[PDB]
Amino acid sequence: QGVAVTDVFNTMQIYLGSQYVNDFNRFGRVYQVRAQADAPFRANPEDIL
Amino acid sequence: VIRKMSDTALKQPGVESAVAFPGLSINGFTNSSSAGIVFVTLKPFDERKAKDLSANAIAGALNQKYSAIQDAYIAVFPPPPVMGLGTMGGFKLQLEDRGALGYSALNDAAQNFMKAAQSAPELGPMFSSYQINVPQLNVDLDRVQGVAVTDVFNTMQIYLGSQYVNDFNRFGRVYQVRAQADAPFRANPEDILQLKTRNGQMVPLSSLVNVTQTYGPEMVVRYNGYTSADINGGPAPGYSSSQAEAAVERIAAQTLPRGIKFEWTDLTYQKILAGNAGLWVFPISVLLVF
Amino acid sequence: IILKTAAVTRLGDVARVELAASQYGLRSLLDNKQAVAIPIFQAPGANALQVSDQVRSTMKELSKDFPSSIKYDIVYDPTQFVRASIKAVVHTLLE
Amino acid sequence: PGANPKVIAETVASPLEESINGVEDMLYMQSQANSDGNLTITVNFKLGIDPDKAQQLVQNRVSQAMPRLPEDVQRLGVTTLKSSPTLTMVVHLTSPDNRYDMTYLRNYAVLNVKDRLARLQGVGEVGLFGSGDYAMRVWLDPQKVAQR
Amino acid sequence: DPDKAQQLVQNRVSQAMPRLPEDVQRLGVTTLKSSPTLTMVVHLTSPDNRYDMTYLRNYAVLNVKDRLARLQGVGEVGLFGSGDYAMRVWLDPQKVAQRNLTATEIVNAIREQNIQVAAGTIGAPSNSPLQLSVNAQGRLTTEQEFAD
Numbered sequence: 001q002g003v004a005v006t007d008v009f010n011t012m013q014i015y016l017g018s019q020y021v022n023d024f025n026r027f028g029r030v031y032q033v034r035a036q037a038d039a040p041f042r043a044n045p046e047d048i049l
Numbered sequence: 050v051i052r053k054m055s056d057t058a059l060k061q062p063g064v065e066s067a068v069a070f071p072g073l074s075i076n077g078f079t080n081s082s083s084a085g086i087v088f089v090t091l092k093p094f095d096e097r098k099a100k101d102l103s104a105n106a107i108a109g110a111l112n113q114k115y116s117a118i119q120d121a122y123i124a125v126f127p128p129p130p131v132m133g134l135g136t137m138g139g140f141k142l143q144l145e146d147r148g149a150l151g152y153s154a155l156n157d158a159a160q161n162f163m164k165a166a167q168s169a170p171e172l173g174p175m176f177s178s179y180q181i182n183v184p185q186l187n188v189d190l191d192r193v194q195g196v197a198v199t200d201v202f203n204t205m206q207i208y209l210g211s212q213y214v215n216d217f218n219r220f221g222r223v224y225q226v227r228a229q230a231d232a233p234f235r236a237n238p239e240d241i242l243q244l245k246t247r248n249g250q251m252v253p254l255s256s257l258v259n260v261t262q263t264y265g266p267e268m269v270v271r272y273n274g275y276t277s278a279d280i281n282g283g284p285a286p287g288y289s290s291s292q293a294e295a296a297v298e299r300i301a302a303q304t305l306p307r308g309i310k311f312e313w314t315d316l317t318y319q320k321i322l323a324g325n326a327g328l329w330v331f332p333i334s335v336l337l338v339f
Numbered sequence: 340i341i342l343k344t345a346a347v348t349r350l351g352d353v354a355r356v357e358l359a360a361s362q363y364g365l366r367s368l369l370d371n372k373q374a375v376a377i378p379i380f381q382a383p384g385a386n387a388l389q390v391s392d393q394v395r396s397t398m399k400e401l402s403k404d405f406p407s408s409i410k411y412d413i414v415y416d417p418t419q420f421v422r423a424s425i426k427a428v429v430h431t432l433l434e
Numbered sequence: 435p436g437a438n439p440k441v442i443a444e445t446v447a448s449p450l451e452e453s454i455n456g457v458e459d460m461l462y463m464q465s466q467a468n469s470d471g472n473l474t475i476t477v478n479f480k481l482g483i484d485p486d487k488a489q490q491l492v493q494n495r496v497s498q499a500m501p502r503l504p505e506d507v508q509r510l511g512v513t514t515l516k517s518s519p520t521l522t523m524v525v526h527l528t529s530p531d532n533r534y535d536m537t538y539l540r541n542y543a544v545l546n547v548k549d550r551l552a553r554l555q556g557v558g559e560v561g562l563f564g565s566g567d568y569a570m571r572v573w574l575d576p577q578k579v580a581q582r
Numbered sequence: 583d584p585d586k587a588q589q590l591v592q593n594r595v596s597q598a599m600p601r602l603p604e605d606v607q608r609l610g611v612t613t614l615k616s617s618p619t620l621t622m623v624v625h626l627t628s629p630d631n632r633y634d635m636t637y638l639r640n641y642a643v644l645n646v647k648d649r650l651a652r653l654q655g656v657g658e659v660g661l662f663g664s665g666d667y668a669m670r671v672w673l674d675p676q677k678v679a680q681r682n683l684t685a686t687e688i689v690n691a692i693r694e695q696n697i698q699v700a701a702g703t704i705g706a707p708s709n710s711p712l713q714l715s716v717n718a719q720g721r722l723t724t725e726q727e728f729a730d
């Protein structure tokens with residue numbers, strides 16, 4: 001197939017792990033924005049498949 | 050205006066020289082486009098031996114001559130006794146919002162505080178520097194053709210604002226290369242509507258953004274992490290400075306709404322922190338001598 | 340600099356390049372004459388008159404290499420006051 | 435450069451203020467944001483503290499908050515310095531013939547005078563008030579750019 | 583003296599910072615001395631179970647830590663809770679794949695619509711009687727704006 005190792009690694013890192021993207025402001029202070037998969041979709045080892 | 054003022058001042062018999070800084074503000078020694086400072090240095094002490102050549106007479110005559118400009122607000126001040134120190138006769142404090150209410154709420158609180166202070170005794174005139182009356186432009190973009198927000202913001206960033214690209218070498222040292230629009234092409238509020246952007250086709254911003262005129266501040270002062278406004282004052286004649294702080298605290302206990310606090314800043318803060326702890330030295334010395 | 344090739348489009352006919360200042364917003368004048376100002380501060384725990392005398396001497400030394408239309412000037416020196424005070428003190432003692 | 439006072443007050447000054455506070459023996463901090471896009475934060479210490487230790491602590495604290503700042507600010511860079519209150523003299527440099535402008539005079543003072551006037555014994559610091567240093571300025575015409 | 587050791591450690595780690603991966607250096611690393619002596623512990627509870635751990639910890643950060651830190655003699659103040667605030671997005675891979683969409687494209691898209699804008703002034707070397715600043719809409723603040 002035409003898939004790349006970087007593609008699957010990035011998808012696995014973003015979904016199963018975490019990814020800190022940009023910042024925002026609230027209550028006069030700076031906070032973070034993070035991306036992660038929903039909990040019920042990452043509860044079993046078969047979910048990776 | 051500063052040139053005319055210096056020309057007028059350089060004819061006084063007592064003065065020696067005048068240095069001018071058109072574009073410098075006295076509030077924090079920052080840069081402002083609608084303010085100016087002139088230092089006037091006098092003749093040596095030997096020549097100005099007459100009574101009418103004293104500093105106060107020079108200041109009075111200069112103020113009287115300046116009061117006929119009809120173009121700006123002009124004030125004359127004497128030098129401070131010690132450089133780097135704050136005012137030692139009056140006092141200053143900060144009104145700051147713990148809850149991060151906004152600018153309008155802080156301005157209303159400041160006006161209410163000034164009204165309450167002017168309605169109360171044991172206080173003289175009070176000054177402030179908080180201003181929200183500076184005009185400005187506000188541009189809004191709607192989400193209604195293949196154009197991207199990033200491009201329509203980058204064009205405005207690079208044309209109206211300055212962009213720093215690369216470096217170069219000359220005279221042995223290193224300097225910068227900057228890009229900006231020509232002066233005649235950005236001197237009007239309607240010039241923002243004449244820029245163009247890509248997508249492949251050329252399209253102007255006349256069908257993308259709208260511009261309106263609004264009001265706001267010019268300089269932002271932040272004290273201890275929160276936005277704050279400065280309040281200057283002094284004790285009323287006939288009373289000491291001890292009761293002035295008590296009166297200020299008493300009136301602030303009521304005139305300040307929720308989420309607004311006040312704090313001493315200079316000199317008075319150190320006097321309160323040190324406290325009355327050096328009053329034992331005279332009894333100690335008397336006992337030692339006895 | 341060549342930007343787009345089609346006919347060649349250069350930087351000269353699209354924009355105007357020049358050498359200028361990197362920051363505008365502050366102007367300094369002395370008697371309505373364009374000039375520059377430089378004040379000198381001391382380090383803590385130093386001498387007052389020695390640094391002043393060295394400054395005058397080195398400015399006089401550098402004045403020889405200045406171009407035709409460039410000159411320097413002394414405007415303000417607040418080290419004079421102590422210069423007076425000590426002087427007065429001595430007189431009192433003598434008297 | 436090119437920033438609005440609210441933008442520089444929120445995006446730039448807030449992380450620096452949130453990181454800097456906490457060092458020993460402070461009284462207060464002040465931050466000023468100006469319309470032209472300049473931010474100045476001054477922090478004072480209690481009497482008796484050696485300036486070198488305070489400068490070192492401030493440097494250590496500011497070095498931690500650099501990655502959170504915007505790309506333009508990082509590329510330009512921020513600078514820190516201890517303040518010297520006492521003044522001993524001021525000197526002006528003039529062009530009586532009106533042959534040289536402000537920027538050339540300022541850069542001439544920078545090139546050779548300041549370096550020799552900074553190496554004497556007892557000098558804390560010297561400033562320079564006037565126009566900026568040299569730069570290659572390109573002024574663009576949007577009409578010609580859009581034409582091509 | 584702890585100050586010299588902290589300065590040496592900071593000077594050493596600042597040299598080795600560039601070799602670290604992008605994520606850790608973009609998040610940042612911290613260094614600080616250790617105070618072995620503890621004087622008091624204080625808790626701050628919600629009897630009615632109206633507030634969870636996160637809000638309570640953030641409130642303690644916002645309104646309690648700053649006042650306690652400025653006290654005289656305090657070395658450091660700790661905090662053991664659930665963490666500071668953050669804007670969390672939870673993705674559903676099935677719906678993402680339904681739209682022929684990938685996660686990296688989503689991350690790129692969210693990163694480009696939540697940036698602040700810097701706009702130059704109007705009539706700043708110009709010959710206009712007035713100079714007016716320009717501002718636009720930058721960072722988002724509410725959850726609805728993020729969802730839109």
Ligand SMILES: CCCCCCCCCCCCO[C@@H]1O[C@H](CO)[C@@H](O[C@H]2O[C@H](CO)[C@@H](O)[C@H](O)[C@H]2O)[C@H](O)[C@H]1O
Binds near residue numbers: 068
């Ligand atoms: C020839 C070169 C000389 C170099 C001199 C060194 C620079 C000295 C800078 C002095 C700074 C200004 O110093 C001090 O500023 C404050 C703050 O505005 C002035 O304080 C002023 O406040 C406001 C206006 O702002 C007035 O309503 C008030 O009546 C007046 O006191 C003082 O009158 C002045 O003594």
